[PDB]
Amino acid sequence: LSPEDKELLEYLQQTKAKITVVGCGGAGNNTITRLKMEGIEGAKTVAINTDAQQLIRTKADKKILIGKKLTRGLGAGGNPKIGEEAAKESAEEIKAAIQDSDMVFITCGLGGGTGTGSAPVVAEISKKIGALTVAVVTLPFVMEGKVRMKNAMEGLERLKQHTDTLVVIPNEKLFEIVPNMPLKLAFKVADEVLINAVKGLVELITKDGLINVDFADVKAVMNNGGLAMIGIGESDSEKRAKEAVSMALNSPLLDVDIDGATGALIHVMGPEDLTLEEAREVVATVSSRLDPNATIIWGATIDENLENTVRVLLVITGVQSRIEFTDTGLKRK
């Protein structure tokens, strides 16, 4: 290289796109494990919990047992305050774990004591170190009781204070996707949605695809994405790309008016025969449903575990004005 170049390269050296995914509580830890085992691209995984037993059986690049002096390696028993105090107690360790991150993904299942309580603390620390802070969390099933939904919503309120974009997935809507779903499989299905949402969002930024997704653009949109929701769809039919995005746009997980949506992140995933043309048809379809001033970031990657099905992950941001926070869950305005 040359004097100018060599300098630049060195510059690229220091700077980067350090992404860290943090899972809190059992649900959060279970998510991290899958990401680690199936190997999420260009992202560090961190699992944190008060329950040492859940944490020891968890797999991640780093593990932080929080609340040692407070919970003595035991869970929070559903007490959000314990999870908060515990996270506060381990603020330094958490900070060390996510230090130097350009972006931090906080994932957990709201409703318990650790995830609900610690998540907002990890988020605050994440912002203090200057990382684009994004959370992907789930709301509990109705069958879990009002108390769980209350703590969840309360935690969703605290969380919204420290995040740049807060993606919320209502588990209850999972029953609308698969009506005859056996109870013993509810959480196995939720696991799948969570993984597809987090991995899908992360790899959209880190995985080489048929088109380049710029990190600066991703910042611009997530920096103030506010409250966000997702849509998932896949098809192998004649118009696979057309059906997939149609499914995603009609997904019950995306329970809200998207016309006022400020932006969107679209991740098209398919087998080796995936073409840029299909990707564009997906974007075009979504583009018409949102405000013409909305910013749309999109990518398209090959997933060899797809055979001949195309998958579409939709993330609609800035929809908090079309939503209201009740202790029974989110309600459409």
Which residues fall in the annotated binding site for GTP? 26-27, 76-78, 113-115, 144, 148, 191
Residue 148 interacts, among ligand GTP, Mg ion, none and using kind-specific CB cut-offs from 5 to 8 Å, with ligand GTP
Residue numbers after which the chain is interrupted (C to N above 2.5 A) read none
Count of other CB atoms within 10 angstroms of residue 331: 11
3-state secondary structure of 35: helix
3-state secondary structure of 65: strand
Q: Report the amino acid identity of residue 301.
A: T
- Residue pair 272/303 in contact by the 8 Å Cβ criterion: no
* Segment contacting ligand GTP by CB under 6 A, of 4-12, 75-83, 90-98, 289-297: 75-83
169 forms beta bridges with 138
Structural tokens at position 268 = 């098209």
Tell how many helices (H) and how many strands (E) occur in the chain.
13, 12
- The reply to whether 118 sits near Mg ion by the rule CB under 5 A is no
Structural tokens at position 104 = 């931090």
Structural tokens at position 260 = 């006022």
Binding mask 123-162 for ligand GTP (x = CB under 6 A): -----------------x---x---x--------------
Among 23, 75, 170, 329, binds ligand GTP (CB under 6 A): 75
* Segment contacting Mg ion by CB under 5 A, of 74-82, 221-229, 282-290, 301-309: 74-82
Instruction: Count residues near ligand GTP (CB under 6 A).
Output: 25
- Residue pair 64/58 in contact by the 8 Å Cβ criterion: no
Structural tokens at position 245 = 């995005």
Binding mask 20-39 for Mg ion (x = CB under 5 A): ------x-------------
- The reply to whether 190 sits near ligand GTP by the rule CB under 6 A is yes
Q: Which residue in this structure is represented by tokens 């944490």?
A: 55
* Segment contacting ligand GTP by CB under 6 A, of 36-44, 153-161, 187-195, 214-222: 187-195
Q: Measured in Å, how far apart are the chain's first and last C-alpha atoms?
A: 58
Count of other CB atoms within 10 angstroms of residue 199: 24
Decide whether 57 or 128 has the Cβ nearer to ligand GTP.
57
Structural tokens at position 139 = 């709301």
Decide whether 75 or 226 has the Cβ nearer to Mg ion.
75
Decide whether 75 or 299 has the Cβ nearer to Mg ion.
75
Q: Could you tell me which residues are annotated as the binding site?
A: 26-27, 76-78, 113-115, 144, 148, 191
- The reply to whether 170 sits near ligand GTP by the rule CB under 6 A is no
Decide whether 6 or 57 has the Cβ nearer to ligand GTP.
57
Binding site for ligand GTP (CB under 6 A): 25-27, 30, 50-51, 75-78, 108-109, 111-115, 140, 144, 148, 171, 187, 190-191, 194
